[PDB]
Design a protein around this ligand. Sequence first.
Ligand SMILES: NC(=O)C1=CN([C@@H]2O[C@H](COP(=O)(O)OP(=O)(O)OC[C@H]3O[C@@H](n4cnc5c(N)ncnc54)[C@H](OP(=O)(O)O)[C@@H]3O)[C@@H](O)[C@H]2O)C=CC1
Ligand SMILES: NC(=O)C1=CN([C@@H]2O[C@H](COP(=O)(O)OP(=O)(O)OC[C@H]3O[C@@H](n4cnc5c(N)ncnc54)[C@H](OP(=O)(O)O)[C@@H]3O)[C@@H](O)[C@H]2O)C=CC1
Lengths: 259, 259
Amino acid sequence: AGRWNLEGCTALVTGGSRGIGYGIVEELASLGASVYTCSRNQKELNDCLTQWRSKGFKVEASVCDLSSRSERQELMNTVANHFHGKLNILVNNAGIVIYKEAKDYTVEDYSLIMSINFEAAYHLSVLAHPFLKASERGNVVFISSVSGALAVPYEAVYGATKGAMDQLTRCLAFEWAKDNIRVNGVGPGVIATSLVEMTIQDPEQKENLNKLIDRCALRRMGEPKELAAMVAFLCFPAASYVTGQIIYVDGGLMANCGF
Amino acid sequence: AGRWNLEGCTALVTGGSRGIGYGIVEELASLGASVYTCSRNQKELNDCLTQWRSKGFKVEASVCDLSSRSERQELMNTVANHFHGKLNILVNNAGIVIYKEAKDYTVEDYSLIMSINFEAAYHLSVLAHPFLKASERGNVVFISSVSGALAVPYEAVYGATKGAMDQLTRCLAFEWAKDNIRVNGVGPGVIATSLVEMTIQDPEQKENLNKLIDRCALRRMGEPKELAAMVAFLCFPAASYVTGQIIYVDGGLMANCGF
Ligand SMILES: NC(=O)C1=CN([C@@H]2O[C@H](COP(=O)(O)OP(=O)(O)OC[C@H]3O[C@@H](n4cnc5c(N)ncnc54)[C@H](OP(=O)(O)O)[C@@H]3O)[C@@H](O)[C@H]2O)C=CC1
Ligand SMILES: NC(=O)C1=CN([C@@H]2O[C@H](COP(=O)(O)OP(=O)(O)OC[C@H]3O[C@@H](n4cnc5c(N)ncnc54)[C@H](OP(=O)(O)O)[C@@H]3O)[C@@H](O)[C@H]2O)C=CC1
């Protein structure tokens, strides 16, 4: 792979059937990377591959439910073989939201979200490790969130799962340093995905969301591709010295206080 | 309570039989409050009650394994009855550590730390909400850690539970503000507790701790009564404007880079 491209690198992106995941798969594939993705639905995954492959992308995908530990270890075996035991990139993007107050969560809501958003990202992380090592040049990216560092309505537990993700990141950077793996986190602000439109369906979630956009410097939502670009760059060999960092692609949201 | 005392306020402090917790029970009681604590050992708790009651501190304690949903509701039911449905202070001090690299952690290990470190704290704050609210002047304080923001050897997963806890502190301070509850965190640095005596028994860990201590301006371990003094202040009516903060009592550990 060259300094500013991933020509020839193998990558695994979770939750790539839509949104940011879908933008990350396209961005990486278009820069030379060979990709593997997964979602909980096959028909959807297949329609994705149809579009992706008409563009000459090298991509493969398969149905996986990241809340199922056993299914997670199945996916790694499958990807490991697909790439012949060499994986350069692991992009932990899969995530789910549950819009409730902290005191309104059920043990089911909490157990579900902590296993898909954190545990799963952590588990695949550890599973991919030996394959990331054998790549001689591994890279791990976690898709965090601004809500993992600041209070946002209805995202206390959701924010808790990302805040834990952010820390695993910093540590893993030092723990896998000698293994040639660089670990970084990318925190999206507000990106126009399917998760957002489903949100705005609510006349209150819609009101909460227009408050966030009005709090950006750019005063608008990002695009999956503007976000996927940060992820892509971190994997280029030109970012050899960047590790253990949580970078936000939020149009300025993070830096704002009274604007 | 006067502005600089906790005269008359009731408090529950998880894990008050040793270390920081034991110290917090002393500082709140010593400042005029009625405390209720818990640990997983009756005998231990019974010597404490004798020590505390001997000094004139109003205090009660019951046994409880915070890593158990049912035992947790059991303890809140008892606290609430002991205090007549009014709770001013809740200090989520209990915690454990399993010193393994992230990849070496077993599932049983993961379940243990997450449940005691972030689940019981989160769950207890919720069951307490009505009594804190009924109390008319609530204050929740979460004992976090420096390892919840910075990479430390063998604390990748320990540090994730704390990173999660920190984010939950910031949102609660916003969700519960109207209920007149203030929510803060206090991140200890290296405090001379039973958790530390145990640790420094192993030569390599003894070497790591010495690295930490060597990295704070004051170059020395804090004392339990030093961490407790900050918890008590935040409960004072004097700190009525402090909410949603994570404050570190670490001898300067969080400001250092090259010292
Ligand atoms: N755009 C935004 O507003 C922001 C999003 N984020 C974070 O960005 C990431 C992606 O968000 P976004 O693209 O908007 O989400 P979308 O809902 O648009 O897509 C999420 C993708 O992940 C997949 N997925 C979810 N759960 C699983 C599972 N259990 N097993 C396998 N695949 C799964 C989904 O597939 P399927 O549904 O078929 O299972 C889907 O392809 C998340 O981690 C989110 O927390 C953070 C801040 C902002
Ligand atoms: N000491 C240090 O340097 C630092 C400590 N901390 C934090 O400080 C807090 C206290 O630590 P520290 O005093 O050092 O530790 P100790 O081990 O000295 O004390 C922990 C206390 O919590 C109790 N506890 C642990 N698990 C449970 C459980 N499952 N159910 C009920 N009680 C429990 C213990 O009782 P028992 O074992 O008898 O059940 C004990 O009373 C923790 O939240 C820790 O994460 C953070 C950074 C630094």
